[PDB]
Amino acid sequence: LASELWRVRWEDVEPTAYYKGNLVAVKRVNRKRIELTRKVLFELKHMRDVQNEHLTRFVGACTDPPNICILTEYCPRGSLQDILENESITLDWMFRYSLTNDIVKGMLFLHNGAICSHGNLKSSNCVVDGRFVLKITDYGLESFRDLDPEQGHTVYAKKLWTAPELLRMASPPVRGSQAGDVYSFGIILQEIALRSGVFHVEGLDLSPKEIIERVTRGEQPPFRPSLALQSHLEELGLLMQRCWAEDPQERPPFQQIRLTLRKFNRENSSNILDNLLSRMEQYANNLEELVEERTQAYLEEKRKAEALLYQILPHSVAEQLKRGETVQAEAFDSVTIYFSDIVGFTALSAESTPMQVVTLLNDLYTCFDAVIDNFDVYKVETIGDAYMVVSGLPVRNGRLHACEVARMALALLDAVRSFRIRHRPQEQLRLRIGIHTGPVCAGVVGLKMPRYCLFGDTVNTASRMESNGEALKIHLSSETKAVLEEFGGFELELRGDVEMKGKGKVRTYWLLGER
Amino acid sequence: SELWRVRWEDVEPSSLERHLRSAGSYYKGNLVAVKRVNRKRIELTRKVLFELKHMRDVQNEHLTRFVGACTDPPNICILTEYCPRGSLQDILENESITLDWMFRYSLTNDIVKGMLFLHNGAICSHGNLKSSNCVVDGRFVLKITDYGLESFRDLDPEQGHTVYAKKLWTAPELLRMASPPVRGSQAGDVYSFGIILQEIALRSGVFHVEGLDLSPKEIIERVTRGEQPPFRPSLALQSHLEELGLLMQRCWAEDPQERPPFQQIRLTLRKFNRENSSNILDNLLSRMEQYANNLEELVEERTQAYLEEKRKAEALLYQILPHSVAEQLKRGETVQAEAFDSVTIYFSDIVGFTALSAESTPMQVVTLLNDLYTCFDAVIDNFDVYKVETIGDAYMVVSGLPVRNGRLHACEVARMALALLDAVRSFRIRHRPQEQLRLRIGIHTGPVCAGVVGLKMPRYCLFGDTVNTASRMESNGEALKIHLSSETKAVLEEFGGFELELRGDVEMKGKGKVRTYWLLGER
Numbered sequence A: 001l002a003s004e005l006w007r008v009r010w011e012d013v014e015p016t017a018y019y020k021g022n023l024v025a026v027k028r029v030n031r032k033r034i035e036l037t038r039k040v041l042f043e044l045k046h047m048r049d050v051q052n053e054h055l056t057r058f059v060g061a062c063t064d065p066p067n068i069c070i071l072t073e074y075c076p077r078g079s080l081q082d083i084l085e086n087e088s089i090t091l092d093w094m095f096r097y098s099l100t101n102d103i104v105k106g107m108l109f110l111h112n113g114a115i116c117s118h119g120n121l122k123s124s125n126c127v128v129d130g131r132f133v134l135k136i137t138d139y140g141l142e143s144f145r146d147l148d149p150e151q152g153h154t155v156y157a158k159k160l161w162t163a164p165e166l167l168r169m170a171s172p173p174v175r176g177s178q179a180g181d182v183y184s185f186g187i188i189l190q191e192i193a194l195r196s197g198v199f200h201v202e203g204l205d206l207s208p209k210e211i212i213e214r215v216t217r218g219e220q221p222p223f224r225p226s227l228a229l230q231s232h233l234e235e236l237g238l239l240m241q242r243c244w245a246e247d248p249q250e251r252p253p254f255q256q257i258r259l260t261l262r263k264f265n266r267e268n269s270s271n272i273l274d275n276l277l278s279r280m281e282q283y284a285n286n287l288e289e290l291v292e293e294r295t296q297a298y299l300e301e302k303r304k305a306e307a308l309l310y311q312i313l314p315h316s317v318a319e320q321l322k323r324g325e326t327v328q329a330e331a332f333d334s335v336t337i338y339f340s341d342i343v344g345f346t347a348l349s350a351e352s353t354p355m356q357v358v359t360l361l362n363d364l365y366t367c368f369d370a371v372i373d374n375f376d377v378y379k380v381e382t383i384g385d386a387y388m389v390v391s392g393l394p395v396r397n398g399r400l401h402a403c404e405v406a407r408m409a410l411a412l413l414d415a416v417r418s419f420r421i422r423h424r425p426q427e428q429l430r431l432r433i434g435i436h437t438g439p440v441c442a443g444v445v446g447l448k449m450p451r452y453c454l455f456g457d458t459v460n461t462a463s464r465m466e467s468n469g470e471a472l473k474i475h476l477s478s479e480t481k482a483v484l485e486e487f488g489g490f491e492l493e494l495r496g497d498v499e500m501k502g503k504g505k506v507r508t509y510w511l512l513g514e515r
Numbered sequence B: 001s002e003l004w005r006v007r008w009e010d011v012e013p014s015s016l017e018r019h020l021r022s023a024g025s026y027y028k029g030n031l032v033a034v035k036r037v038n039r040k041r042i043e044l045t046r047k048v049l050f051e052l053k054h055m056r057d058v059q060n061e062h063l064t065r066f067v068g069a070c071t072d073p074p075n076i077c078i079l080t081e082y083c084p085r086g087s088l089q090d091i092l093e094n095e096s097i098t099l100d101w102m103f104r105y106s107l108t109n110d111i112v113k114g115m116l117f118l119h120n121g122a123i124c125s126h127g128n129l130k131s132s133n134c135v136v137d138g139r140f141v142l143k144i145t146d147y148g149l150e151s152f153r154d155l156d157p158e159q160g161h162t163v164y165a166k167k168l169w170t171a172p173e174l175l176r177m178a179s180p181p182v183r184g185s186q187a188g189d190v191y192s193f194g195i196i197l198q199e200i201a202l203r204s205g206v207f208h209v210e211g212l213d214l215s216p217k218e219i220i221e222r223v224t225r226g227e228q229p230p231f232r233p234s235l236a237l238q239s240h241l242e243e244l245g246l247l248m249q250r251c252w253a254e255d256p257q258e259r260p261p262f263q264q265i266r267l268t269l270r271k272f273n274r275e276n277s278s279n280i281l282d283n284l285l286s287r288m289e290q291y292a293n294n295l296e297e298l299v300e301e302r303t304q305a306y307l308e309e310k311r312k313a314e315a316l317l318y319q320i321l322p323h324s325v326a327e328q329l330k331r332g333e334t335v336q337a338e339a340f341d342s343v344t345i346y347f348s349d350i351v352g353f354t355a356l357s358a359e360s361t362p363m364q365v366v367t368l369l370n371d372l373y374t375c376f377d378a379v380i381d382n383f384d385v386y387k388v389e390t391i392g393d394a395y396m397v398v399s400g401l402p403v404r405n406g407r408l409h410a411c412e413v414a415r416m417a418l419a420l421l422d423a424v425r426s427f428r429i430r431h432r433p434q435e436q437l438r439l440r441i442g443i444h445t446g447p448v449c450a451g452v453v454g455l456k457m458p459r460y461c462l463f464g465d466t467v468n469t470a471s472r473m474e475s476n477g478e479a480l481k482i483h484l485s486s487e488t489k490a491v492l493e494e495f496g497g498f499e500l501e502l503r504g505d506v507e508m509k510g511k512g513k514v515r516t517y518w519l520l521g522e523r
């Protein structure tokens, strides 16, 4: 009695955190009148002088102005609350019976021990050890009740977890009752069977205060959280319902519950640690399976991000730079450049609302992208109305580069003559189209966002030719006309070497169609 | 009959496949091993009967068990019990899985006990013991693979290079000797166990040379040839492994005389490796729990990495659009077309760029644009302005477009016209270091109207006469000089603090001759 070996007096505690080397967990208490009491001393001595395989152990207590708390061995894994809820990780049926048997074995010694059951043995105040040896906090020692009766409805519900029979709008003893322990065990079993929060029945929905008041008032039919049945067994549910019966006599005793649990677990009939070892091994396997799933998801996400990162590349450098390769600058001997511009667009957009002028430039992108993708061309840049077509830039096509860039304008000049402008349905848009061929030089440019620029003297000549071009006609240069005549099958027309800008007299031809 | 002839017809397929490397990237009783043989015939003599009897009588907690032999002459099978979670070599393969020193020592003592039990029996040595032929079980009960079935073996001369690659675990004495013992001697098994212990002690690969790192064939040939110092690896760099080194030095013994009596070696290890040891079987549970905790830590870190990658992909999805518009589009709301009373438009162009790039190598022309992009993208982030498009060597920047800023937009697109006209003079050209890149700048103010156009690839586009006016104004500028407009000039004069200078009444392709001014500096 005079040993005083239960108190550390806050003198030597490691700065829950560790304490005297051991990493115990401490729960605080809100009280100031706890000085000394012989009965409380005997209760604390009884609480310290107990140990069991399924029961936890008390470590230390502090009752000084610096700290009013009790510290016990810290459970490494999570509490039973989170695990039983599940949907994070799964569990086996034999695992369920192992946990239930451990809880029952602990409760049998707890209730029939130094004193009656602590009463506050909620399903959210018990956890498992490192080797999954279920323990419970579940002792108050007549001093853990930090006085605060005026908390509110949340405390009302978390109490309403308690047995219905004791909770009858009256003050129960702080120690508790055997019926409270029986109902706590029944509630824990129901939570394990249903795996959904605490005290959930089929129903539709239940507020904490509403359900608590309905239970306390007393319905003519017995208010019981009826759990959904299953094909494996139903005697466990019947025992759970009988334990929760309003009549205390109908509630079976701890010995009866233990006998029923043994009968249910008689299928296993294993009493050695081997069951625990197997359960731990299968739990580890389940964890590994979850790990595999999540790493697969991470790989998929990384792949998606990589695919997103290179949307502007011309589908060739994109597949090369992705596969750890490197792309150097290149110069191509002959490429075809095509320009498309809206003629007189600076006036149509003048007399139009911004909402009436943003649905037109967006309705022409969806009309040209359906035809600019059929052929083997590429759109390098697009700023407003002007376009950009380069043929053969990614992979050389030889002499074909001058054939696909000329059939694209003929299929786009007729596809724009039936385009409906919602701002004015009785009007036809005018577009100028120019084509040129010549050597070019290109390469991958950009670090934050990879673009693809074409750098050559032919671009300026093509721009000059396209600028000086009549509407509703395709203007081609002599270099393109050479390849056109070499291939054949298209009707080109001589226009005249008179109208030329930036040079002297240069012959440019008109594209009229291909048979 | 030996009651160990499993029929090919009875149960050939069961539990098709699950990837054994379940880490970072069967017949009516349990899962069984899937192997075969190229003999294509059965000629079991009395020796094969004795081997089958020895296999049937051999029942130990460590050594694996075999269901039976095959029946069909074409397809052979050795239905051995499959111990899960891969092999010890596989266990050390993934560096993500972390061996615990005590845990590794317990594993080594377990394999030592298995080796002693195997040696004491009729089979003097397995003859094929290796790091990859020792798999842990569901409770990490170690076994030895191919430690039996003396009737058949892969003794057919074939794949000499693959022999030098996959039979590297053999002892130097066995390798030097032309005739190899299929049922090897105890000394060879001891040397194989020593090599396995050396591999387990370190974290690197086989033979852990950290030297020339030559091919396995060359190393094996050198070891077979030998010298005064035998070709052999060191132990480790740990200063607290003196006993491990002392045991391993006797383990690399070259002659059978120096070969230790492996039972005595295991006793010495229990003296040294078993530091206070543990209980009969609690150690297994503790070491399994430690491994489970390790896996939990690994998966938590992996989930954190996945969340970071998801955030990165979300950022990468929308970046061309303005930050405010991108947030308003990712939230769920729809951006509508808006008209603004007064905005600032800025044009920048390299003067004579078509001539400097004419006489240049393609690499020397692609290394001059990327460097300029990295030289302007750092000074444009120190102001309050937006970039909407960048086509080649021309820049176009808007001010105040995303969020209305009142009379501040005209006071922000001009302050950046002075920090960019003084940061383009210290630029460096790779292929000509004695030249300065001339730039042309134009600024204008006007009532633009902009929207978020585009499907599946949206971009922010501004429309109105302001763009055309700005282009016309900037098409008649001068290099190394900032040219302003009357609309911007009024706001600049109203704000104060900028020393403007009159320019003249140069005509333009438009309304005609209008007032113009230069921006000299900011007081």
Ligand SMILES: Nc1ncnc2c1ncn2[C@@H]1O[C@H](COP(=O)(O)OP(=O)(O)OP(=O)(O)O)[C@@H](O)[C@H]1O
Binding pocket: A025, A027, A072, A073, A074, A075, A076, A077, A078, A079, A120, A122, A124, A125, A126, A127, A128, A137, A158, A159
């Ligand atoms: N394995 C464990 N060992 C010791 N303490 C633990 C363990 N797991 C959780 N705890 C702690 O036990 C406490 C459980 O809740 P707490 O005792 O504070 O609530 P309570 O007021 O008794 O109410 P209720 O049981 O209704 O939730 C928490 O402080 C939690 O951190």
Ligand SMILES: Nc1ncnc2c1ncn2[C@@H]1O[C@H](COP(=O)(O)OP(=O)(O)OP(=O)(O)O)[C@@H](O)[C@H]1O
Binding pocket: B033, B034, B035, B081, B082, B083, B086, B087, B128, B132, B133, B135, B145, B146, B154
């Ligand atoms: N129980 C088992 N545990 C681990 N690996 C096994 C097992 N049974 C068969 N294997 C196979 O053995 C491989 C590793 O050993 P190894 O490559 O040496 O082949 P082996 O079939 O065991 O025999 P051998 O030494 O003749 O090649 C594994 O990749 C797997 O395919």
